[PDB]
Amino acid sequence: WGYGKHNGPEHWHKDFPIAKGERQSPVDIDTHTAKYDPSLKPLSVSYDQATSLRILNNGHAFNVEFDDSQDKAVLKGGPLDGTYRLIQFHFHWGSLDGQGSEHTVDKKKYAAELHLVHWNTKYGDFGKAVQQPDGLAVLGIFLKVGSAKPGLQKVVDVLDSIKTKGKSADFTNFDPRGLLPESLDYWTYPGSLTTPPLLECVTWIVLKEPISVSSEQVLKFRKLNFNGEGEPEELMVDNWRPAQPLKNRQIKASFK
Ligand SMILES: Nc1ccc2c(c1)S(=O)(=O)NC2=O
Numbered sequence: 346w347g348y349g350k351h352n353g354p355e356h357w358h359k360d361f362p363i364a365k366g367e368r369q370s371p372v373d374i375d376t377h378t379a380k381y382d383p384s385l386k387p388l389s390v391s392y393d394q395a396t397s398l399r400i401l402n403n404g405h406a407f408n409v410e411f412d413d414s415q416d417k418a419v420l421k422g423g424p425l426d427g428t429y430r431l432i433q434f435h436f437h438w439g440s441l442d443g444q445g446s447e448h449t450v451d452k453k454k455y456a457a458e459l460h461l462v463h464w465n466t467k468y469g470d471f472g473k474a475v476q477q478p479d480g481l482a483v484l485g486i487f488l489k490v491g492s493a494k495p496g497l498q499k500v501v502d503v504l505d506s507i508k509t510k511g512k513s514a515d516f517t518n519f520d521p522r523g524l525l526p527e528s529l530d531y532w533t534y535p536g537s538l539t540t541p542p543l544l545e546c547v548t549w550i551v552l553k554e555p556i557s558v559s560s561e562q563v564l565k566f567r568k569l570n571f572n573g574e575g576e577p578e579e580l581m582v583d584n585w586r587p588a589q590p591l592k593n594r595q596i597k598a599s600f601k
């Protein structure tokens with residue numbers, strides 16, 4: 346599986362039949378269909394004690410990994426019951442500034458989308474959490490091209506060291522608060538992982554307010570490679586799944 350013609354999203358259902366399931370992600374967020382829920386509590390993002398460890402090119406995206414062996418960076422509140430622990434973040438992006446996000450907003454595609462992945466601590470570890478319908482909470486943040494995001498630049502600068510699949514680099518003392526917009530207003534709905542195995546385990550929490558990154562920052566994302574060292578260069582671009590049918594679901598908004 347990957348993102349090309351021959352093994353991209355339209356093919357994934359053959360190995361992963363859940364691809365055509367009842368709660369697949371991403372979706373288009375139709376802002377005028379979403380229901381404002383005055384009872385959704387504010388989101389609590391508690392990243393003070395976050396301990397970043399490593400950055401890895403996995404052949405599909407790059408992942409910034411965290412020490413999740415204790416409650417140190419956690420998401421609570423909003424639509425969530427209990428405490429969800431940050432494990433990793435990664436992005437999805439385009440070959441052009443006009444595409445790259447997975448979620449869309451009134452069919453608008455952003456240049457990229459950040460996903461901060463958390464697991465429900467009632468399930469003990471990530472692997473058990475993904476078997477549960479409320480196992481994960483993914484905080485999704487859109488990226489638009491404009492001004493640079495200074496809190497992204499440490500990431501951008503290490504990409505050269507992980508150009509190809511399987512490469513990793515120590516990535517300590519990275520503060521993911523630097524990647525958040527000002528507002529924590531959000532939409533939320535029940536969905537899935539957006540890559541195989543496409544498990545239907547996610548509560549999505551998608552911020553309304555995009556962050557702005559520079560063109561130069563996103564260009565550096567686009568210099569990464571899907572292939573391994575020594576193989577023909579296939580640029581890591583357009584690593585996004587397109588919108589899937591909403592089916593029998595409701596999107597709730599935290600704001601009017
Ligand atoms: N645990 C996860 C593993 C991979 C992915 C996700 C979660 S995502 O945030 O749905 N987008 C993904 O690629």
Ligand SMILES: [Zn+2]
Nearest residue numbers: 435437460539
């Ligand atoms: Zn993702």
